[PDB]
């Protein structure tokens, strides 16, 4: 499958650099932001099923699932929410201006805790606090499975997915963690962050742990 | 991808029917057989890498990995062994007569424990003790990733894989468990069976467990 390349909207490119280069503390809130986004997407498929039930048939179970993949230095956060079409990935994750982007960059430069990022609608980008590369794999009932990929350059790619597991419906954030942020692969640390920041979630949060049989 | 359909060699169809219909006890040995096959495949890539270290670069870690997927009533057994090309899947898993097939069917009808199946070189088919459907997903350094699928009919399908996760190299047995054999989804049962039958394995056996964060 041939990939397509897109340029980030200018302020998003600026936001990404500010996040990667000027934020030193409270990185762990990336997980809160990603859990919140997942919860949001789960709400929308659930609501959209409030007046149409066939929607859930692609993935009847509603969940958030976190999967450390230590060998690849990867952390995946999956949900069975409403998902994103190809156009939605392109529009929502880079090409269109987010209204709060500038205000957030100003706030941050003024000394704001990065925890404030969600208040501005750009919490997705907090993932760059811990990862230097990300693939967003998404399946909406309304489209085929796609892969959005960024390395915090100035452009991203979108590719029809012929390489990852089928998700019936929903989104996977595949974070390629930085070498100094591998603590987020660890069961105990993941649990701690969830308990501190994601106490009130309406959906099961599953953690996938791989143990050697001795 | 369009599927290709192939007929099973006659005695294999017979073997499958006998396994599914006449074996009542010691079903758990299916796991020993599948673990042994995985170990075998891991031996072969390891040996072959002796004269071609680039062989491992597709998947540097040598492991066996067991993943229960309760939602789907599925149990996966994965290894990063040498894998099978498209022709190998077709030849090894259905079209070619296995020399011990007849002798095993006779032994079984004479009262032999099914545990003896490995002795006749047909241990793969023990999976039908617990599953009514199986997909074998395989990736050899020498070919593309393929899916072999059977429901113990008289025919199987082989399909170029554009729907599952990329394995770097190796084989996944995806067992669709029968409703009275779901005990093999449970961490405790799996550990028990490994401890009894697969005490001596040269490769780490990893078990992937999914737990809700409470
Ligand atoms: O928030 C996102 C940008 C669009 C904002 C509006 C939400 C749309 C509903 C579907 N949202 C999603 O797939 C989704 C998700 O499930 C988990 C996530 O970590 C992220 Cl980043 C997203 C995408
Ligand atoms: O044993 C198999 C039939 C061919 C016998 C000779 C083995 C060839 C080397 C590659 N073997 C495999 O991919 C393999 C595996 O990794 C795990 C398994 O459960 C099974 Cl059934 C197989 C295939």
């Amino acid at each position: 499958m041939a990939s397509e390349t897109f340029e980030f909207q200018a302020e998003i490119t600026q936001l990404m650099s500010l996040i990667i280069n000027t934020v030193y503390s409270n990185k762990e809130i990336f997980l809160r932001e990603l859990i919140s986004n997942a919860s949001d997407a789960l709400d929308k498929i659930r609501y959209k099923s409030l007046s149409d039930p066939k929607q859930l048939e692609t993935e009847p179970d509603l969940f958030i699932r976190i999967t450390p993949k230590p060998e690849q230095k990867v952390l995946e956060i999956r949900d069975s929410g409403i998902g994103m079409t190809k156009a939605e990935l392109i529009n929502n994750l880079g090409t269109i201006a987010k209204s709060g982007t500038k205000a957030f960059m100003e706030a941050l430069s003024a000394g704001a805790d990065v925890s404030m990022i969600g208040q501005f609608g750009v919490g997705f980008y907090s993932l760059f606090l811990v990862a230097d590369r990300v693939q967003v794999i998404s399946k909406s009932n309304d489209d085929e499975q796609y892969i959005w990929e960024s390395n915090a350059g100035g452009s991203f790619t979108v590719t029809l997915d012929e390489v990852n597991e089928r998700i019936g419906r929903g989104t996977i954030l595949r974070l390629f963690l930085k070498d100094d942020q591998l603590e987020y692969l660890e069961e105990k640390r993941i649990k701690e962050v969830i308990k501190r920041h994601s106490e009130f979630v309406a959906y099961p949060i599953q953690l996938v742990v791989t143990k050697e049989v001795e």
Side-chain angles (χ1 to χ4, degrees), chain A residues 100-101 103-127:
Chain A
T101 308
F104 177 64
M105 294 191 291
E106 315 280 18
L108 196 58
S109 302
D113 191 316
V114 300
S115 184
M116 296 291 292
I117 190 167
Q119 300 286 306
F120 292 89
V122 285
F124 168 72
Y125 296 96
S126 70
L127 74 84

Side-chain angles (χ1 to χ4, degrees), chain A residues 53 55-70:
Chain A
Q55 291 291 313
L56 296 172
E57 300 192 350
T58 47
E59 175 55 270
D61 289 321
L62 306 179
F63 61 89
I64 298 164
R65 183 176 300 151
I66 300 168
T67 306
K69 292 180 173 183

Side-chain angles (χ1 to χ4, degrees), chain A residues 34 37-38 41 44 79 82-84 92-93 124 171 173:
Chain A
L34 307 186
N37 290 359
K44 297 180 177 174
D79 65 72
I82 195 170
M84 280 176 292
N92 296 331
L93 302 182
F124 168 72
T171 296
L173 265 59

Side-chain angles (χ1 to χ4, degrees), chain A residues 3-53 55-67:
Chain A
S3 80
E4 294 181 62
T5 305
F6 301 83
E7 305 298 317
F8 273 104
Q9 194 266 343
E11 276 61 30
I12 295 170
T13 293
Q14 309 171 9
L15 174 61
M16 285 176 57
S17 288
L18 199 58
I19 285 168
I20 296 166
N21 295 291
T22 72
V23 173
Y24 290 86
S25 304
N26 209 21
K27 288 175 186 190
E28 68 182 42
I29 66 94
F30 85 96
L31 190 61
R32 183 194 69 203
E33 292 304 317
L34 307 186
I35 289 179
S36 174
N37 290 359
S39 185
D40 293 350
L42 286 161
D43 288 349
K44 297 180 177 174
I45 186 66
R46 235 216 311 130
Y47 188 93
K48 181 169 186 296
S49 75
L50 279 174
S51 33
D52 176 7
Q55 291 291 313
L56 296 172
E57 300 192 350
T58 47
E59 175 55 270
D61 289 321
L62 306 179
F63 61 89
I64 298 164
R65 183 176 300 151
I66 300 168
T67 306

Side-chain angles (χ1 to χ4, degrees), chain A residues 18-53 55-101 103-194 196-210:
Chain A
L18 199 58
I19 285 168
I20 296 166
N21 295 291
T22 72
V23 173
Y24 290 86
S25 304
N26 209 21
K27 288 175 186 190
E28 68 182 42
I29 66 94
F30 85 96
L31 190 61
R32 183 194 69 203
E33 292 304 317
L34 307 186
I35 289 179
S36 174
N37 290 359
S39 185
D40 293 350
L42 286 161
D43 288 349
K44 297 180 177 174
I45 186 66
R46 235 216 311 130
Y47 188 93
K48 181 169 186 296
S49 75
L50 279 174
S51 33
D52 176 7
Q55 291 291 313
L56 296 172
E57 300 192 350
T58 47
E59 175 55 270
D61 289 321
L62 306 179
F63 61 89
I64 298 164
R65 183 176 300 151
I66 300 168
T67 306
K69 292 180 173 183
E71 58 289 352
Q72 295 135 265
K73 291 166 173 180
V74 156
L75 178 65
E76 287 178 9
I77 302 86
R78 171 174 181 187
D79 65 72
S80 50
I82 195 170
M84 280 176 292
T85 65
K86 182 192 181 186
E88 295 182 295
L89 284 168
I90 293 168
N91 284 0
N92 296 331
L93 302 182
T95 64
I96 297 185
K98 262 287 174 172
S99 67
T101 308
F104 177 64
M105 294 191 291
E106 315 280 18
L108 196 58
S109 302
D113 191 316
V114 300
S115 184
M116 296 291 292
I117 190 167
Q119 300 286 306
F120 292 89
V122 285
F124 168 72
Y125 296 96
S126 70
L127 74 84
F128 289 101
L129 294 169
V130 304
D132 52 39
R133 185 183 162 201
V134 53
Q135 292 171 358
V136 171
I137 304 162
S138 198
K139 177 69 174 62
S140 160
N141 287 341
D142 295 317
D143 208 351
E144 305 284 359
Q145 188 163 308
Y146 279 87
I147 306 153
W148 176 99
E149 182 166 12
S150 173
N151 63 345
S155 71
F156 59 92
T157 61
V158 176
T159 311
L160 185 64
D161 194 331
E162 294 185 346
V163 299
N164 300 299
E165 61 176 327
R166 295 304 88 176
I167 68 194
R169 183 196 60 248
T171 296
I172 295 180
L173 265 59
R174 182 179 285 155
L175 307 184
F176 295 78
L177 298 178
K178 295 191 265 248
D179 289 343
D180 60 310
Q181 304 291 329
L182 304 187
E183 75 193 62
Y184 297 110
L185 296 177
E186 297 173 11
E187 175 180 4
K188 177 174 174 299
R189 184 75 177 116
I190 297 173
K191 285 189 172 169
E192 173 184 31
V193 176
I194 292 173
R196 180 170 304 108
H197 301 288
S198 302
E199 178 170 13
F200 302 100
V201 177
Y203 309 95
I205 299 175
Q206 306 166 348
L207 173 67
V208 179
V209 172
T210 301

